[PDB]
Design a protein around this ligand. Sequence first.
Ligand SMILES: C#Cc1ccc(C#Cc2cn([C@H]3C[C@H](O)[C@@H](COP(=O)(O)OP(=O)(O)OP(=O)(O)O)O3)c(=O)[nH]c2=O)cc1
Ligand SMILES: [Mg+2]
Ligand SMILES: [Mg+2]
Ligand SMILES: [Mg+2]
Length: 539
Amino acid sequence: LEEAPWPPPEGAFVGFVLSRKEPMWADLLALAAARGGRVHRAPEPYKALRDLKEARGLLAKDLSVLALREGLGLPPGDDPMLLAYLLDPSNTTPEGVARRYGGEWTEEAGERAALSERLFANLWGRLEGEERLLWLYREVERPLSAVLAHMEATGVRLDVAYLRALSLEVAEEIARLEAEVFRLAGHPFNLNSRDQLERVLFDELGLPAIGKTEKTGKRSTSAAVLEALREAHPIVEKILQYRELTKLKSTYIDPLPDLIHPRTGRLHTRFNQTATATGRLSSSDPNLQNIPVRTPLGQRIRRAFIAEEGWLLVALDYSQIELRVLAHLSGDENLIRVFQEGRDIHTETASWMFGVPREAVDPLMRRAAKTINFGVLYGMSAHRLSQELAIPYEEAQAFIERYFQSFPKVRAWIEKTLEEGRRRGYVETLFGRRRYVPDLEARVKSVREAAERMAFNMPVQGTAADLMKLAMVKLFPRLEEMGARMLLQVHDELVLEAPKERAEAVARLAKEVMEGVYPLAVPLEVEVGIGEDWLSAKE
DNA sequence: GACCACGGCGCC
DNA sequence: AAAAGGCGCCGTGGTC
Ligand SMILES: C#Cc1ccc(C#Cc2cn([C@H]3C[C@H](O)[C@@H](COP(=O)(O)OP(=O)(O)OP(=O)(O)O)O3)c(=O)[nH]c2=O)cc1
Ligand SMILES: [Mg+2]
Ligand SMILES: [Mg+2]
Ligand SMILES: [Mg+2]
């Protein structure tokens, strides 16, 4: 390429180098742009940012996030990563995409700029003819990246002093548990070490081993194994409680408070847009899509996520979402009838599980049933079901049989989906998002059958993902106009932040936009709650 | 210090 | 553990 002076022309492709991967924390080391066999390198990267109309290139969102941090409204535009991911969602890294589509991901801004332009040309040409993938790029993914940038740069408030106080309390409980565990073992050991614990449990206490680990074939000490051993020795229960507290303390209570950004006073995750096989987003550094909620200590941690003073959080969550999608994809009359009648599959399974009438099902009962409902849908074995519910094997077998016989077309849809996946080599969502599954043709049954479960799940989980993404795209401009904020997406859930005076109107609006995102053969319902913290905002 | 495979486990 | 699918992070034991 030929060196030309900064600034580049309009529509040029950017390349930039960060001191670290997280845009909210990085120093902008270098910045460059490329167009028309020219490369323009910027003397002063930060000042050079004021010269761009949009971030166009590999990882566009990240530079946009950094620009937003510095008070610059630089929106992300075309990004070759998005094109590659739509062509084949195994395209997840710039290193991989470069190797596959025509260059090398280096550590130099100018080469990265030239690389962005080359890759965009090639990938765009491969997208020609693919009208449905084109529709997803222009109407969903590309504008979505703008929305995600604003979400990352805005972040979410955390009650730091609360978490610190909670730490000290949980530290003391952990000490009680480990001390009791050592007493029962007769000696101390590293309780955090599953190799040491296995020896204690199965060699010293002579407990029966239940299962083996995958790669190394050791005797498993997982929660499920321990659960099976709960009656066998008093140490087991203590170990389960220890596992829960230390998981929560080391993963959330201790690290979160140290991640508060000095400028914003808030927590800033990254919303990774090309990271899953199904079209879901992922969240990292920190992951805020896996904040605890299910156990009492977990709920206490979730409370730490709060609104700015004078504002309220609004949480909206699609009802039974993948079941609704499955009703649309499969066309099962019975399943459609369920939703047109306003019924609840989770609640109904809960009624069976606990042996109570539908009217007498508490939220806890309904929620334990959700894990059962999807486990079965996506292929859980009778054996596992019987062990999870502590019922006889043949009772678990019966539940699974009735489950599919009551929704007769679901199995037909699965069979069609797999058949089509064998011929084409890929499966797709309602909007044409593809996932390649070559192992549908594998000659080893266990491999083929795992491939099959991956394959028929993808259209369902992926269609739900498409709907959520499209809804964020439609919702975002409305919120800006109302002076409200989009903070987090947790798969089928959105968390917003609204001025207290408008929290209610924002809630109503958001609900309507999400339920009407894309009319199906069944209604989409959204549960919405409002509160001063994340826990109270989901009731 | 930084990486890794692994088992394990938090959320959807 | 197990014929659920999809993620990212943690500590240990280990290397470099
Ligand atoms: C307390 C509690 C609690 C919270 C969440 C779950 C869960 C879940 C799962 C969700 N999913 C998919 C299908 C779900 O429809 C989708 C969204 O999860 P989620 O919002 O929790 O459930 P869903 O929408 O079906 O019902 P909802 O309670 O009406 O929201 O993610 C799974 O594939 N497997 C699961 O185990 C289980 C218990
Ligand atoms: Mg839901
Ligand atoms: Mg949800
Ligand atoms: Mg170490």
